[PDB]
Structures are given as C-alpha cells and as structure tokens.
Design a protein around this ligand. Structure first.
Ligand SMILES: CN(C)c1ccc(C(=C2C=CC(=[N+](C)C)C=C2)c2ccc(N(C)C)cc2)cc1
Ligand SMILES: CN(C)c1ccc(C(=C2C=CC(=[N+](C)C)C=C2)c2ccc(N(C)C)cc2)cc1
Lengths: 189, 188
C-alpha cells in the first residue's frame, strides 16, 4: 500500500467503530484493530485522536447524506422529507452518532468545528432540493431558500431534542406530522 | 423558621445558579450566599441533586413570570415575548437553560427538571394561543399543542445553531426566522 489508500483503510474502519459503539469507543486502538494495522501506524495518519473522531464523524454524515439521495423523479416533497426526517431503521446509528456529536461539541472544540461543518452540509443539501423544487415548479417560495432551509433544520433538531426526552405526544408519528406540516407552510402556501 | 429559612437556601441556590451556573453550585458557595453554616444545607436537603434540580425549575418559573407582559399588548407580541425575546437580562437564564439540557444526558434529576421546564414552557405557549384564538387575533389551523411544540422546536433549534457562531444566523436573523413561523402558524 502506497500512502493514501492506507489513510482510507484507516478512515473507513473508524467510520464503523463510530456506527457500532459511538465516540467513546473510537480509541486509536479500536480503529487499529478494526483495520488490522499496527496501533502505532494509526498515529501516522490523523494525529490527535480528537481528529480521527471529528474527521471521521464528517465522513459518516457525508455517507448519510448520500444514502438518502433517492429517486429524483420522486416528488420534491418526498425528497425533502427523506432528506430532513427519514425514519429508515438503517440510519439509527447515523443519527445516534449525530445526536452524540452534538453534546460532545460542548467540551471538545475539535468536534464543534466539525459539527458546524455538517450543519452546513445538511443545509447546503436542503437548499439544493428547495431551489431544485422551486426551479421545477412544485415549490412556492415565500422566502429565500436559505431561510427556509435553516428554519426546517431547526424544526428537526428542535423536535429531536424533545423526542429523545420521552414525550409520548412527540413520537415517530408526531415527529412526522409536525415536519410534513411545516413543509406545507413553507413551500405550499 | 422551619420553611422561612429553607427558602433562603433555595433563594441562595437560585442566585448562584445564574451567577456561576451548575458548575459553581457547590455547598460551600451556596451556604456562603445564604449566610448560614454548610451543615444546615444537608439538614434541609437530603441529596445535593434535589437542590440543583429544584432550584433550576424555580429559576425558570420566575423567569417566565418576569417576561409576562401586561396582557393588553397584542397577542402576537405576548407569544413572541415568551419565545425569543432578545434581552440582555435573559442571558443568565438562557445559559443555565442550555446547560440544563446538556447535563440531562448524564444527571437523571437535571433530566427530570429539564423535561418539566419544557412542559411549562409549552403549557405557557398553549395559553397565549388559546387566549389569542379566543380574542380573535390568531387563526388556528392546528391545535395549540402542536403549534406550540413546533414553535418551541423552532427556538430550541435555531438556538442550537445560534450558539455555534453562525453569521447568517445572528441576533437579528434569529428574531426574523421566529416572526416568520408565527405568521404562518397563526396568520393565514
Ligand atoms: C437523511 N437526513 C439528512 C437526516 C435524517 C434524519 C435526521 C434526524 C432525525 C429524523 C427523524 C427522527 N425520528 C423520526 C425519531 C429523529 C432524528 C436528526 C438528525 C440529527 C439531529 N441532531 C444532531 C440534533 C436531529 C435529528 C436528520 C437528517
Ligand atoms: C421568556 N422565555 C419564556 C424564553 C426566553 C428565551 C428563550 C430562548 C432564547 C431566546 C432568544 C435567543 N436569541 C435571540 C439569541 C436565544 C435563546 C431559549 C432558551 C433555552 C433554550 N434551550 C434550553 C435549548 C433555547 C432558547 C426561551 C424562552
């Protein structure tokens, strides 16, 4: 192996330890084991364990953003929803790590810089679908796509913050009703 | 006497909580604030957690009363004042409220207290909607409960983006995005 394909065989191993056990299990030794490489060789790439868990967390999200890009001929409403509040069981670890990363960003500026970058990735993706739907002629925009993109994200994050507490009146079904509701007020007035 | 001093202790915990936060709510700094011995704190409080959790609820409870307007202002200005008021004097309440949901992942009592404040916050938003719906100023296309949660989620949400230092989400923009969802939720 030359130099850079190594970096990937390492990075991808970390991306599963994140999905499997979360940040608290993304120790240099766990990535070294999952990859089948010497533990000392891991320090050779992505110094500062903090980096191989923030730099890895991004790749997990980027993978999440791509595992949701679905049939383009589907209604721009169907696309936007799945890109904001998908209920696929396969994404539970992706969300779990995202929820997890949001807290750690308090006591880990390294994460914070990364969590900030995903919010921009999550935002730049919604803006695309908002603009695209607007250009196609299905979305009616009463405000800039950017403003709409931030407000919907805030709805998801905000509701997730309540859904995790255990509110019965805010569960899967209700988390969907609210979201689909707001989409109508923002794009189908 | 019996409770007249229990309140001073609570008033001493509610005070340092806004000044120092949960990290600085030690028994030695709380007993100093009330001006009493430290031992008398455990006498009135079994666990140190029951003091941290209850005091936090008591801070927010009065916080919501402080920001209660005259009831004659427009129901929109009232609902707004209880959602996203941009006031410097709230920062200590907010900072404590942000910390409250963070520690909730590891402190079951702070989790219990935070869950209760969100319901109080929600119960108070329902009130303004129903009163503004009765006065005929609001137009409801959904129950006050659902609208309230969506409005609260919008605040908690942008707030999670605001603190990160996003330039396009500033003090002014936060106000704008909040005024917008009110317009759509209640004025169609
Ligand atoms: C495909 N895609 C782009 C997605 C997919 C899912 C989400 C989030 C989510 C969706 C539905 C949920 N339920 C039905 C229970 C719970 C959480 C979510 C993720 C992170 C988050 N935070 C970090 C606070 C809050 C919510 C976001 C983007
Ligand atoms: C009077 N009243 C009932 C209030 C008053 C203020 C708030 C919150 C708030 C308002 C405006 C902000 N800016 C203009 C920057 C930032 C935060 C707030 C508080 C806690 C919170 N979380 C715990 C997530 C999120 C937002 C909520 C209720």
């Amino acid at each position: 192996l030359n130099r850079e394909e190594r970096r990937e065989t390492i990075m991808q191993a970390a991306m599963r330890v994140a999905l499997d056990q979360g940040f608290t299990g993304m120790t240099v030794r766990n990535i070294a084991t999952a990859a089948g490489v010497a533990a000392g060789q891991v320090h050779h790439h992505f110094t500062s364990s903090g980096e191989l868990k923030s730099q890895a967390f991004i790749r997990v999200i980027r993978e999440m953003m791509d595992l949701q890009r679905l049939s383009r001929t589907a209604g721009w409403r169907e696309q936007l929803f799945s890109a904001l509040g998908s209920e696929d069981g396969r994404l539970e670890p992706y969300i779990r790590l995202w929820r997890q990363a949001q807290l750690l960003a308090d006591s880990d500026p390294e994460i914070k810089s990364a969590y900030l970058l995903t919010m921009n990735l999550w935002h730049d993706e919604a803006v695309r679908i908002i603009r695209a739907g607007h250009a196609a002629g299905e979305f009616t925009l009463r405000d800039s796509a950017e403003n709409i993109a931030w407000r919907l994200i805030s709805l998801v994050c905000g509701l997730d913050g309540i859904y995790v507490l255990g509110m019965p009146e805010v569960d899967d079904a209700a988390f969907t009703r609210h979201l689909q509701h707001v989409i109508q007020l923002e794009l189908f007035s």
